[PDB]
Enzyme design. Sequence first.
Site, PDB file in Angstrom:
ATOM      1  N   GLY A   1      27.154 -82.244  -7.305  1.00 50.25           N
ATOM      2  CA  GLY A   1      25.908 -81.693  -6.798  1.00 50.25           C
ATOM      3  C   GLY A   1      24.664 -82.565  -6.857  1.00 50.25           C
ATOM      4  O   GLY A   1      24.183 -83.064  -5.822  1.00 50.25           O
ATOM      5  N   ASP A   2      24.134 -82.713  -8.073  1.00 50.74           N
ATOM      6  CA  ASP A   2      22.935 -83.495  -8.355  1.00 50.74           C
ATOM      7  C   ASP A   2      23.337 -84.855  -8.974  1.00 50.74           C
ATOM      8  O   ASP A   2      22.522 -85.513  -9.603  1.00 50.74           O
ATOM      9  CB  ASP A   2      22.004 -82.696  -9.322  1.00 50.74           C
ATOM     10  CG  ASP A   2      21.160 -81.572  -8.606  1.00 50.74           C
ATOM     11  OD1 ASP A   2      20.633 -80.648  -9.293  1.00 50.74           O
ATOM     12  OD2 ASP A   2      20.988 -81.605  -7.353  1.00 50.74           O
TER      13      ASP A   2
END
Lengths: 152, 152
Positions: free
Chosen positions: A18-19
């Site tokens: 995701g990040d």
Amino acid sequence: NTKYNKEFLLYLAGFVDGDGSIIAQIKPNQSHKFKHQLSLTFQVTEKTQRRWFLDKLVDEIGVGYVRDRGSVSDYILSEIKPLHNFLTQLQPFLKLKQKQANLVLKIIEQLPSAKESPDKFLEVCTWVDQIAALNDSKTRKTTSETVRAVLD
Amino acid sequence: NTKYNKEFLLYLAGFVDGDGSIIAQIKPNQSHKFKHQLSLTFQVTEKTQRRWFLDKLVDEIGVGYVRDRGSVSDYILSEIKPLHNFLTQLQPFLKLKQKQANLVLKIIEQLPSAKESPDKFLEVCTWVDQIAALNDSKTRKTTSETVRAVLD
DNA sequence: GCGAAACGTCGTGAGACAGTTCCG
DNA sequence: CGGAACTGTCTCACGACGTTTCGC
């Protein structure tokens, strides 16, 4: 060198997708074989107010540091050996960056030979064009080509 | 009322914490008793280049859908019943959003007796305020206080 | 000569709401 | 009259590299 809890990898493989980010780089340098540095990096960034998460990772992963840069923080892991050991147990649980993890993981495994021959260096020095391809690059400024032009 | 494989939740929770979002709002609607609709939304945002991941998701979770905001795209999930069952099984795995989640559950539960006494209603609008507090709120209007125009 | 923290920056690619329908 | 669909976008929170620094 260690093995981590299957469940820690599962969840971290999610947060990394995701990040998270798996960067490869050809940093041009003088005190260095062919004028360039072979650098590999694994980082996860987040809002400085949520810095704890990152600090936690420094404790759980067992290596790497966290840095501050304005309204954001990062976790950095670049110790080429423990990087190989980490990208080893996490490479399978990936789904969006499994590709570009391996290459990194499959470059270190050949980093000694790197220096050797320019046509042996360029070799590796290509993978780090592939990964950069797989990511969402938007400010790249040094490729195998620019180091193709190592013609003296 | 399906149950999920742990290896799916452990990883999705990681994702969700990364590029995920657990919203809650006071959409001022003219119908509705107090003229304000309570709305809950689970969603995961991603570049339309990786929407096949959002789709497998629709298929993996068994409910919800994908939208298109041009460059980026989302996986949206608002139906209460499903929303409640999904958020119950992911909850023990989230780490930066685990609270926000629970407040959503709590809310869901009270939703009914929530539009009884104008005051038992504002109590839930507060469950909501609490939630936006936990997020990185930046463009919000209608709050539990904005609603104070109902007691009159 | 190497690998390794330490330090800075562009340009998004995500996120946390607001609005206004559409059924039944 | 409650509840999702369809729809709109403001403001960051990231991801992704870039020049510095240097002893082991």
